[PDB]
Amino acid sequence: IHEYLEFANIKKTEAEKTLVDNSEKCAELLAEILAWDAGEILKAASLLGLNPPQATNVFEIDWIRRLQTLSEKTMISTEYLWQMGDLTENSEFSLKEGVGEAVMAALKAQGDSDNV
Amino acid sequence: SLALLLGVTRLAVVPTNNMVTFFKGIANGLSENVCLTTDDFQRQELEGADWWTLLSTNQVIDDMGLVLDIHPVWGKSDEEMLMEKIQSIGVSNDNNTLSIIVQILIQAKNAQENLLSQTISAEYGVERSVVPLQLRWLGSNVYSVLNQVLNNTPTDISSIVPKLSELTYSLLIYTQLINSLKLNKEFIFLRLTQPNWLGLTQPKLSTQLSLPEIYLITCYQDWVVNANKNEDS
Amino acid sequence: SISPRGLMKQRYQRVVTARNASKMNFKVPNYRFEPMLNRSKSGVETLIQFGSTLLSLLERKDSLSFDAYQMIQSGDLYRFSIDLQQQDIDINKASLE
Amino acid sequence: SISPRGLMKQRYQRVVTARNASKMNFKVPNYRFEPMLNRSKSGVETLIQFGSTLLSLLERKDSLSFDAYQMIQSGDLYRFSIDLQQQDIDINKASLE
Amino acid sequence: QQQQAMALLDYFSERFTNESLYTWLISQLSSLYLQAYDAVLSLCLSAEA
């Protein structure tokens, strides 16, 4: 955890931010310490100023704890959990009509059996 | 795990400056009173090295001739091969002046090996009897690692040679090859000595590994336990 | 009867940093060499005696602190044992009814 | 009820090669015999002290590593104990039905 | 019982004189013995001479 956080903090303005921190391998170790998916964690690039983002040294890990447990309550993606936020504010209707159907299909994929 | 061990879709790692603290630790351990004879160690005409200048009343010829280094072989390696190699290279003075400079050299060879076998055992969790065999079977040499001190590896720039930075990465995968299954050094010693004699094909003198070995060495590692008599028969 | 459970995969190692650092010396003498060899020994070997005294006492300290903490492990088990078993008096009364 | 089974016939010995090898000496002296008997002793007996220190510490090392590995032997047994016994709640519910 | 057996393994593995201290002593002392052994033998050899 220390070697990961020390690497995340290296020289954002003078070097690493415009080089995307080498996102393809720095964001990999954040998945590896969790034994988790190095893929969908890259959705974090939807916030924090075009950084990876990773140098916010706790809150992203603290949230990913809850994303990992939610990802074991249900087989839904973090990509769809973002839409469940976007729909809050009297938002566009076709996204709600689609998200309801997508969650229904994600339940059929488990059914009265167990499956995945 | 098997795909990683077979080298398909390989791992990623960060060159943290802690690695320099480790290699500077090796350089420090080499420098603090070990006083090692590694000063241009192998290559022919070994001239200008301190140790035999002091002992010159007993023997002068510090330059010797051909090289002072060893490759392992089964049944019996040891200082008898190091003696026979230096005895073969045209010394006509077969008296005690030749044998005394072998018993002066044995502890000086130990002082090159004992550094790695005692230190890296505390980094990676392997017994000191496995370390030099693991190092060669990975595709390395004890002096080639120690020469990286002379290549300025102890300098705390955030860059080091691939010969260390990818070797260190490769050591972890070969550590899982000796912990996801456990086996004894005599197997490694045979495998490293004589691949075709063990039963492999000539290309497997290289560092590369594939499933036709992994089946046979695993089914051997079962059969050596399953057999009705102890280890050595 | 539908599910297994995970385990304590408690296999992980820990690392000891086997390396050193050190510094140089100077000074000028005031009397002979062998008279100092006849004084330096006993002060050094007394430090080996003090260091092995400290080490061997610290094993005696940290051994007995384990023997202490191992006793209190029974305290919850007595509570759970009584508060499970006491119901067999109430069952033996319910059987009489 | 038709068959027995084999056993661990774990009787086999192991062999220790009790033999040696050794080499000759030369050199020429620079000062007297008894002054060297008055120096050679303490360096040798310090090596007996270092060797017995190494040996007695290595017993303390390899003893405590056994006490460690002996604890994790409980981890599977708790898993199997819970995943066998938990069914008696489901049987006590099936008996109420 | 399972969780306090895990807490005993934690309390044991967080003991001061755990496996690391004997390992650290021996892995240094192994050098002190060899640095003495390669040096002492000239005293008894010069006693013969």
Add this chain to the structure above:
Amino acid sequence: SLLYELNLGEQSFVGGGGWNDLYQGLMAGETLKLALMRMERVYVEQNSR
């Protein structure tokens, strides 16, 4: 005193910094025995009329 009384060039046996602050000075005395052994052997050789 050795290097003055024999009038000799540098050999630096007594290196400073042998204390330890993870392990509170353990083994910081046994090194002094080996320093005296490395030192004594200069006197075993380098004395003559």
